[PDB]
Symmetry: D2
Subunit: 423 residues, 4 copies
């Protein structure tokens, strides 16, 4: 029964053609949904009660579109999101962190960072946003300007550069090099370049981000018809599935959740499609290619990450449990696209929110009492991941897990991988 | 010899990549497609696309197959649609640069939950034979016996009509292998399939069926809601263009338009959009792995047509042949070349008007109907048809003097004897 | 180039010119051959063990010391010739030469002692002389038995029974010497610890032009099973009388290593020849060159694709450690082992990094010479009060010995493989350590 | 039939990985195909007898090597005459006649910087006596090849120059040497003295790989069956060396003292023949063809384009043979570079080209003696039928087999462009 579920016959195929031939509509997905859902907050999704339904449906990142609404409007949206998120904090083994992303208005006709963007970025730092989706990034200096406007207090905010025009596509490599990740902003991109070429830019950018090990978001009109209709079109479900098969870390909803009549249903639909698409991923070729393309490294976190993903595939590990302060150890595991869920146990609430940008990372916020012996504290965070995993359905007694830790406290010292039997 | 400009176009840097990941990384929005569009466009005929003048615009935009939906309209209504299509097609018989064969496909109403073929389908199928349709899109095919019933309804005079089985429910998906074995091809009928099975599972059924059809070397059509928003809007959504591109990258031989052309406000624009996306997607196909996998998966064969076809596709890739010119009576030799997905266009020269229309079901086949009177000496009749294919190729933009072409012929007249592959320099 | 650019900038272009590294990074086997370079010097320690047959030319304690320094890892006693008294003296001389270096772990070299049986002769089962010789082996503490003319699984069970309860730890390497042994190979390998491709008798039992097929098939199946395989007989035959081998002989040694053999053997070359030490030096020189020429990219990928999924944590840790070692060009994989099994499971994935196996078992230290790339270190310190400190001291012992022996340098990365509790069977930890 | 797929290591050939291919190698799987690696036998006191040479041709000798390091011009002229007499004794039966090449192996430069004066005299002797190939000793650079070419003069333009790589400089300057040479000999005797003995296998494997990539013949030479000079059976290292030279990709294997001065010249040839057939069946064509295909550059030459199409077609149907018409041997050489499992039966009217194509693995030359037919299409058909009739007589073909037929569109060399699939009747 285990080998009939999650497209395992198609996963064992020796060629991609045979993999497609073995895809089965009766093979049910078992693993947790890896691709994060970004939902744009607006009139249709602003209430605390509606936001609780969206968190339960699968929303991982709340997007604030600063093209519309005042600072007072967005502060209320943030407070409502935080209230809905913290309503589930009473059960720590099942609490789901939710990131808050600020999407900038953009430069418009201006040459650099607009004055409104400087004010909105400052607002973001003051309100503790986790991510910035920087509109119309055309070159590396645009990213440096966004970074500078965040100041010394916004050092930890992730900058996701939105590629929306020909210049952004042509200067992609220099933009990705200085950014934390990319958003394929298909709405403007589809007007700036011929509509029939957007798929080439999406597939290229996702590929280059996967190669770089940096998050990539597929955005705009994924389930457009769901703004007025309860069910999407056949092109829309195919688009969501293909963004996941392309290698996107995140999928987004704009009008579908901000102003549409079915915001919760749009989130449920993206969740349902993503789980199906993630099981249909051809890991045999994907891992081989990612593994071959990733350069040789003398960084112990990078070295441990490859060893752990290889070990997870060898035993069909249910999960890779990793201790992370900044999210980096979980991100380095995520770049190899393991089938095993990457359960990231962290004390940082911000890192827990931000790792939703990395596919297959399931953040757990550690709020249990400290142990006096560092080694004892480490084993406690590990047993915590195992209890949250059992509660959420990721793990069962008898499963094997790969545990990734470091040799001393503080970020940057991950160097250990262990094979553990559950219970 | 070819120049650096040649190797910058049609995603050639991405095509030479050693891995699929590197292939994606090398895809370039500035790399323009050069080759002719190889995925056929099926357009549904209705009130928005019925007039002779509108049909001429649709043929110019790229329509290769006209679909008659027998779920609506009388026999008199469909006969008029057929006559209007034929009039619009024959209006280009003058200029060889613009003349193009257009297939006529009859889409059946269906069993509507009843045993065997419905009485209306028996009558509509008989209408199709009497009006000389080329293809039948058989609705709600659930098992092999459904195909045999459609085949028996094509009566004594319609055995040459191609049966494309529409897979629209769970049973059709589960019994796919037995259905494909007795069918000429398949249509992934996503509209009903999306209601019959969970909407989030349709992509698995589409990708599986396209894969199995590619492995079998039989045509597969991707259908329904590809550019749905274009029924009321002049431009499609980002999901819609992505869907068209992904159906081509999946391996579909044909893409379809339904309400977009039958009843919408922009039928010609919907055809133009599918044409534009398909050309872009066909250049982005990763032929290196696709050919290797089709080669490895295809069983060994002692059929000389199958053996010649793989030799010719290999020869075309080796020299970047501008085209593979094949002589075919039934379309079979062109279909066997098409199954290996050559980048080179397959120019199929035939005396059969029906085979010329039907080969639009096979990706990359460009049919040329040959009407010259036969030569007393057979080898001369063959050379005249090879030169007809070269001159139409030169006229249409495929070929130039100095290009290399692969020519596929047989050792004796009649169907079933293809066994020769020649490398020719265009003079 | 982009997959090695930062590491090339860090380690230098000279590092990537040595040990056939340009040929190792090739994307195809054809390109790998095209990039093989006679100027690319081997850097790694020799990983294929040399088995030298002991005889009149290699019996003195002084000669045996020169053979240990030349590279002999396993001493073979051919029980087809000589009395029990003769073999006991050979064993004592080997042990005396081996223990003459036991003053420091960075100079000590464990040497296994293998007993090669006379065989069944015309008989259907175990001979009475073999029963006596096998009991002699147990009484004299031999590490391995090379069982002659193994034709089926019951032959190996008979050898195992004749070793008795005290010889349970002795490794049985079945010699395949005829058509029946080749046809029943799978059942023989299943019950044996390893195989010897006994080419001398095999070349008489089957057509001489078919021996290479049997050698390549058996080596492949042993590599797939993760069990040791020895290539034997006439590898450097002409060196019995000549100081230099023929062009076919050096090619044979290189090709046995490229085929995947864990061990290579010398018979008359060391037992009776005029150049026993030179024959060992020649096999050492060829094996080092051939090991660097191995196409690890395809070999590792194929060992992973062929190896079935495993729920054994030792097996899971071993593949993770080998993957980590390739990622950083680790100088070594240091493993703690009681029976040698954790080191054997690392060895089956054919890492380029040396597997330094730290053990308290003197017998396991001798027996792991059967596994390609395993460098045994015998730990002699008494156990620490805290188990977690005892483990750490053993790892530091492997690092300090590795530094003093040239395997490791300051700045190198090493992969360390340990377990969660004492006793055999609990390896489950892999650590990436920087050498300071 | 099931029996067909049990022979010639077909289970091992269908394997998905090289490791599984090795695991499936079967000593009971008998080779069926004709031996495709040519055997070069060195002529000497043990192999000059016209009667002994007839036995060596029957055993499998394809190329007779004259070592100009020993013997006078008078001695070598007699060698040539004896070889030609033994070869032409079988000309009475054209369907089974085997052409045999004559190769002149030069003495070399010695302490000199360039072409020695003795080599100039020996080279002119070769042109005057109609040798087919020159094995040029101690080639260190491209100018050495140009000097050998110049010493052959205007009448020796058709002679093939195989450069012998015997030292470190030849290995370092390999690419420039191969570019101007027709092929290479891995001259292991001197190479094993010039560089460390333990490095020769790296130079052999590299050179064979580069020659295979270039589509040019490569010869593995020296001490392959050395012990057979005095013993009736070779050592285990010797049979392994022959098998591994074939698995490496060598087009030719050589015998020196084994046939020139030993006591078992015919048995040494029979042993190389037996080992080569076994090793050729054990070749992992799945990866080999894929890699040769991927590495070979795109081509606009119709002979090259036809050759790859014909090799692909031959693999698709398990063709027993690829029958090619060739004037210079080039069309057959271009088929050979893709290492088809199907025998390449080359029909030619050029006696020299028939002898020289023995340098290309898997090329079986047939000398066609009939004067041209008036109708060119009938002349082409008669040659193809001669290849079929020869192939049936020699065991290459049977009724029911499929064969790939490679021809051109007009007479003369350089116009091959047609591939056809033919059923044997
Ligand atoms: O060559 S294909 O286009 C073909 C399509 C139809 C066929 O029937 C077929 O045989 C051949 N094919 C396309 C799908 N992929 S895939 O395995 O799904 C895959 C998909 C995506 C990959 N990354 C790397 C690039 C960034 C995103 C993640 C991958 N990395 O490695 N493999 C990958 C195989 C290759
Ligand atoms: O990767 S390997 O070293 C390995 C893999 C797992 C093993 O278990 C093993 O022992 C070793 N391996 C070594 C043998 N070859 S091979 O298939 O015999 C072969 C042999 C030779 C090839 N050319 C290129 C060089 C000139 C001659 C033709 C070839 N081109 O493509 N394949 C080729 C596969 C690759
Ligand atoms: O992924 P990051 O940010 O580098 O954090 C990983 C760090 O977490 C740990 O596992 C635990 O460290 P702390 O006890 O400081 O939380 C470290 O050993 C390791 O360096
Ligand atoms: O693709 P099909 O239907 O088998 O037709 C291919 C046939 O066409 C030809 O090339 C030409 O035949 P005709 O002269 O009868 O048209 C035949 O030699 C070959 O058998
Ligand atoms: O390779 P083996 O034979 O399983 O031995 C590995 C064992 O060695 C250890 O690393 C150390 O164990 P000891 O304290 O008994 O020496 C164990 O944790 C592990 O189980
Ligand atoms: O391999 P080569 O030397 O190019 O010779 C091939 C030539 O042989 C032929 O097949 C037959 O030519 P001939 O009639 O002159 O022998 C030509 O059509 C072709 O050009
Ligand atoms: O800004 C965006 O999100 C877009 O343009 O798609
Ligand atoms: O009938 C159709 O075309 C469908 O259901 O999509
Ligand atoms: O016994 C042996 O070692 C042999 O026969 O090779
Ligand atoms: O010259 C040769 O043949 C050699 O040196 O091997
Ligand atoms: K915005
Ligand atoms: K219908
Ligand atoms: K013995
Ligand atoms: K010479
Ligand atoms: Mg925008
Ligand atoms: Mg329908
Ligand atoms: Mg023996
Ligand atoms: Mg020499």
């Amino acid at each position: 029964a285990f080998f009939q579920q999650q497209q395992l016959p198609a996963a064992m195929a020796d060629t991609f053609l045979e993999h497609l031939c073995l895809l089965d509509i009766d093979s049910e997905p078992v693993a947790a949904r890896s691709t994060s859902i970004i939902a744009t907050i607006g009139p249709a999704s602003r209430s605390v009660e509606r936001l609780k339904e969206m968190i339960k449906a699968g929303m991982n990142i709340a997007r604030l579109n600063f093209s519309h609404g005042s600072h007072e409007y967005h502060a209320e949206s943030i407070a409502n999101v935080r209230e809905a998120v913290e309503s589930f904090a009473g059960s720590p083994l099942s609490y789901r962190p939710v990131a808050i992303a600020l999407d900038t208005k953009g430069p418009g006709s201006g040459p650099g960072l607009s004055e409104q963007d400087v004010r909105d970025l400052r607002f973001g730092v003051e309100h503790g946003v986790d991510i910035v989706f920087a509109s119309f990034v055309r070159k590396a200096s645009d990213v440096a300007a966004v970074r500078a406007a965040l100041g010394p207090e916004g050092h930890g905010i992730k900058i996701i550069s939105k590629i929306e025009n020909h210049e952004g596509v042509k200067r992609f490599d220099e933009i990705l090099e200085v950014s934390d990740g990319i958003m394929v902003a298909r709405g403007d991109l589809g007007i700036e370049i011929p509509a029939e070429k957007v798929f080439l830019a999406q597939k290229m950018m996702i590929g280059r981000c996967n190669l770089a090990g940096k998050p990539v978001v597929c955005a705009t009109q994924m389930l457009e018809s769901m703004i007025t209709k309860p069910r999407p079109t056949r092109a829309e479900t195919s688009d969501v599935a293909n963004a996941v098969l392309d290698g996107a870390d995140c999928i987004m909803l704009s009008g579908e959740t901000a102003k549409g009549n079915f915001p919760v249903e749009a989130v449920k639909m993206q969740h349902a499609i993503a789980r199906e698409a993630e099981a249909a991923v051809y890991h045999r070729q994907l891992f081989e290619e990612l593994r071959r393309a990733a350069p040789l490294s003398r960084d112990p976190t990078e070295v441990t990450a490859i060893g752990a993903v290889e070990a997870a595939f060898k035993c069909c590990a249910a999960a890779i449990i990793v201790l992370t302060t900044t999210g980096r150890s979980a991100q380095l595991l995520s770049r190899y696209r393991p089938r095993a869920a990457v359960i990231a146990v962290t004390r940082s609430a911000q890192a827990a929110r931000q790792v939703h940008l990395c596919r297959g990372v399931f953040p757990l916020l550690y709020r249990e009492p400290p142990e006096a012996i560092w080694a004892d504290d480490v084993d406690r965070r590990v047993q915590f991941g195992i209890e949250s995993g059992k509660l959420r359905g990721f793990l069962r007694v008898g499963d094997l897990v790969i545990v990734v830790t470091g040799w001393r406290p503080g970020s940057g010292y991950t160097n250990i991988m262990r094979v553990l039997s559950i219970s």
